[PDB]
């Protein structure tokens, strides 16, 4: 009996496969990912969230005479109910919407309209990575990006220095990153918040005349205006990362200034407005709006994903401070390493709802001289029970099941693609760097299986891979650069 011996010899193996990794798709729950997308809509002050849940669907049909309509083809769906409380001065409407989402049958595929569809993992960088002359951080909808430009400065004695200035390329504009803090917390507020208020001082012309001569070498004095001078320490100026703040601060100011205008927030709030709106009448008001938007760029999911400590995760300002403190180390890191990449399965499926909600909320954010309640109602008025299914199928988010063999473990169960929504990969872009290999690939990915149609856009996970638990599908637990 050859077969009995073969079975015994197979059972006496030692390098068994990883059971947990293969049967993973059924562990994911839609309700876990549903919350951040709904909470995104909270930008409008009136709208308040109330949660969402899965509704029961089991029911025994009772005989009826109502000319019922039934479909020829079979499909499996599941009902999700969301609730919102729209509150106004007198109206306190409650809106309950229902959405259909496909259910995972046999733990592997969806069945829609008699056809079978296989979900696939997507591989993407964790964030805070580096691109050509820029440092970018991925986000749900708004990709905040920092851009650096070299500049030249001359001191009092005439020594020339070349430094760097950083701008936040947000809202299709180039704006210094210090003016946001100067508008929010103020001059002294920003100085205290950064922690450099003990090293930065501003002196007038009369104080410049009475400047400490013996402290000139110890404390380098830099020009601000024709009369106002800046007092800063050379020891603080030693580090380039520290010098970044000095360069940006000197770049922010202009020739025209007033001593009492420095302590006034409006003095540069109107400057930011003029940067945004050219008309003088609204220079204040429009600027205020931007500030509000700048406090809602970051959402909860990006907070949960990031691996930084709690102290550097309070809000957008703390994130910007932590990013700008360690600019050099972050820009010195590479990109192709696998230590800072993750895999998504459902967040790239729930895209159309987020897109629709953003499109709806922008319209009501840009409304003027009208009643808000009607527009807020129109935001939620259109919710089709076949919205998600139609948008998913039409845009080809899911991949059609076209296989002929019964060997499915290596073919479709473990397959990852770098293309799709928010994918830097693009055939016409001709980015040959992304299609290459890195020494970190070995041990956690397949170096052989590649699609012949387009190399590098499809591989296969190693069956022996052990994803660490409680890390939200992270290959490692620490970034490539320790930063410690």
């Amino acid at each position: 009996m050859i077969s009995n011996f073969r079975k015994f010899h197979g059972n006496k193996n030692q390098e068994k496969f990883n059971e947990n990794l293969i049967l993973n798709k059924e562990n994911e729950s839609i309700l876990n990912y549903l919350d951040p997308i709904c909470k995104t809509l909270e930008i409008i002050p009136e709208i308040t969230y109330l949660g969402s849940s899965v509704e029961p669907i089991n029911k025994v049909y009772k005989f009826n005479k109502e000319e019922k309509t039934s479909d020829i083809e079979r499909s499996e769906l599941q009902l999700i109910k969301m609730s919102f409380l729209i509150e106004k001065d007198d109206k306190k409407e409650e809106i309950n919407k229902f959405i259909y989402f496909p259910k995972l049958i046999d733990s592997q595929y969806f069945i829609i309209n008699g056809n079978r569809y296989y979900p696939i993992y997507q591989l993407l960088d964790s964030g805070t990575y580096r691109t050509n002359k820029a440092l970018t951080l991925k986000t749900l909808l708004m990709p905040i990006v920092l851009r650096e430009k070299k500049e030249t400065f001359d001191d009092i004695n005439g020594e020339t220095h070349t430094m760097l200035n950083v701008d936040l390329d947000l809202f299709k504009s180039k704006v210094p990153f210090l003016i946001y803090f100067f508008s929010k917390f103020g001059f002294e507020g920003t100085l205290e918040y950064f922690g450099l208020q003990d090293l930065i001082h501003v002196l007038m012309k009369e104080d410049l005349d009475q400047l400490d001569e013996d402290e000139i070498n110890d404390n380098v004095i830099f020009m601000i205006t024709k009369n106002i001078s800046l007092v800063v320490d050379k020891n603080f100026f030693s580090n380039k990362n520290n010098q970044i703040i000095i360069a940006t601060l000197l770049n922010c100011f202009n020739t025209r200034i007033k001593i009492d205008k420095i302590y006034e927030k409006d003095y540069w709030v109107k400057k930011l407005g003029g940067y945004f709106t050219t008309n003088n009448s609204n220079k204040q008001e429009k600027g205020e709006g931007i500030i509000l938007s700048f406090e809602r760029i970051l959402d909860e999911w990006t907070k949960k994903i990031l691996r930084t400590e709690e102290k550097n995760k309070e809000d957008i300002y703390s994130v910007v401070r932590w990013m700008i403190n360690n600019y050099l180390a972050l820009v010195k890191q590479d990109n192709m390493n696998l230590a800072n990449k993750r895999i998504r399965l459902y967040e790239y499926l729930l895209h159309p709802l987020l897109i629709k909600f953003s499109k709806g909320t922008y319209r009501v954010l840009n409304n003027r001289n009208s009643n808000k309640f009607e527009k807020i109602k129109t935001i939620f008025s259109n919710i089709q029970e076949g919205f998600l299914v139609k948008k998913i199928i039409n845009n080809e988010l899911l991949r059609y099941d076209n296989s002929v063999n019964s060997i499915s473990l290596f073919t479709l169960i473990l397959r990852y693609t770098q293309s799709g929504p928010q994918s830097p990969f693009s055939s016409n872009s001709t980015n040959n760097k992304l299609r290459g290999l890195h020494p970190s690939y070995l041990g956690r990915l397949g170096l052989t299986s590649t699609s012949a149609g387009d190399p590098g856009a499809s591989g296969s996970l190693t069956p022996f891979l052990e994803l660490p638990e409680n890390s939200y599908m992270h290959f490692t637990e620490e970034p490539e650069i320790n930063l410690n």
Binding site: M1, I2, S3, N4, F5, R6, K7, F8, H9, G10, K12, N13, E15, F17, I22, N58, K59, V60, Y61, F63, K65, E66, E67, K68, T69, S70, D71, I72, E76, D106, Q108, D401, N402, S403, V404, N405, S406, I407, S408, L409, F410, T411, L414, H438, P439, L442, G443, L445, G446, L447, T448, S449, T450, A452, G459, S460, L461, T462, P463, F464
Partner: protein, 649 residues
Amino acid sequence: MDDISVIKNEDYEGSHRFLAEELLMPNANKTDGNRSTMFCSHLAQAVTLQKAEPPLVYTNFENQVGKYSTAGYRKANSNYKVIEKIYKNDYNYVLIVQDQETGEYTLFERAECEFLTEHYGFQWDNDKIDSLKKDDTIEKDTVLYKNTCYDENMNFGYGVNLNAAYFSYKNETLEDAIVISESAAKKLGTFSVNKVKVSVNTNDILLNLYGDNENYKGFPDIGEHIKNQIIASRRRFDYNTALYELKNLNEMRDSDTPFFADGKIVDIEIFSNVPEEELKVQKYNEQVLYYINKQKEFSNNVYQKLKKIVEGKDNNVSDKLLHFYNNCKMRIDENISYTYQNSKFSGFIMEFTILEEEPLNKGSKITGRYGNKGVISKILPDDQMPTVAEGRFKGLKADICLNPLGVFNRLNPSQLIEQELNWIAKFIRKDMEEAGSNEEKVSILLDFLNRVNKEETELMEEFINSLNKTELEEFLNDIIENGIPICQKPFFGNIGLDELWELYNHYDHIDYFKCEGISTPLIIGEIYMVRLKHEPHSKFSARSTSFMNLRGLPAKSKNFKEHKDLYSKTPVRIGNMEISNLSLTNEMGSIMDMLNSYSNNETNRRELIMQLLTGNPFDTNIDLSDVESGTSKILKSLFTCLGLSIDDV
């Protein structure tokens, strides 16, 4: 790039944790990367074989792969107990089963086919489930039904073992070509199952293709096989003129719309949208009136069978059972109208599932494990193929001959190692078979296994000493008949070069086989073969005169997708450089005449068609006319829309 320095071979010792999809292919540390990377795609495209066999040289890794692939077999999650089983058709029937640990209820449905994709599928080898009957007990590890790949004892297999040799046959193996004996072609097989959706309206009728007027069999029966590759043909009927149209329904007419398919019909299902009272009287719509009724009967059965279960106080049912119960109770009710593609059709529409076995034919492709891809060129009767007629074992005949020219040029020496291993296995097996009692026979085996894979010797000894005398004798007879399996791992643990040298040196009584009418020593081994998806009938196309586009140029028509025609009647376009390469010859007027009379001018096309049809068939002397072409008119209209015109002189 100095990033390689992080990689250290000290930790990657004795563990295959860095291989994906290469676990199946053995001796992976010999072939290059360019040929190895083709194996992944080759495994991705591999159709099912009827007579699947486990590989002779196994990597000890395919068993777990087969176990963890749940797309081909279905086992029992928990211990069940059969409650009831009901029939639906000649073959397909369902059964309702109940747990013994939770009280829930589930259903299991027996089938005879599966639609993997638009063309390819397989047939369920449902044997254990059929034996289950009359309130039996299902255990945890039992498997209900399985695909054709899996064998009796869960051992995987995705190919066949064929006797092979490296030889040249009348230059028929140039480039990548393979000859194959008739017996091997008989051994190799494939399956094919397809679904066809025919449609019938109120005006249309069905011709009496099968049977006489007594039995107006419009379509084949449940288990019969179709003939002439025509499943059913429907003819439009008009109220105004039907006296001279419906005189004889036993023959095809000029304006017909037949449906083409091939195979054996296994499953049908009919959905109707007309009142039954109007359908009861029509004589030509007879067979449908049969099947529909039968179908409804089945539904009624379930409504009278388990209505005490779901409608009772327990209600502990799974989602699948409840959904199926609601779906089946939908039909027996009244005033129900179906819809298709978000539209309400008028006449009834059915479904057909057709199964067929396709044998190996010229033009197909077969490849080995190491990506030595080839193409079948010419099959021969087994008599013509080379045979050995001098040695002790006269009679062995090679089944496939491979190209010997491109073995070293292709940079993949694994095939030679595999063939040498199988040849040494053949020699040692014959030596063992010649003489020796069971007391020492196993020793003759063990020695050979001692110099190939040291890990296998311990398991060999344990298994051999575990059994008793009769089973040991049966196992020895079986290994004598089929052959000694040899195991070696892909990357870490295998034979290289020094081991082969020592193995050759130790056995001094081995010489090449001397064939007949060859005068050159030759070796024949056994190699693993897997079929591929690529077929000649999936891309062949021809076109005489199909439907024309709205503008007037020929265009692709969607009829082959709905099984309304045999060939994919798609024209081939002339590319940008094709016209220039044709213009390589100094003649240009002939090119212009050909293009204009083929796909530009309607009057010229009609004149050519007529002049070709009527006249002299042996010798043709057509004379084209001069009429302004369509493309010139299109261009003139577009340019005069822009505001510019092309003026001669």
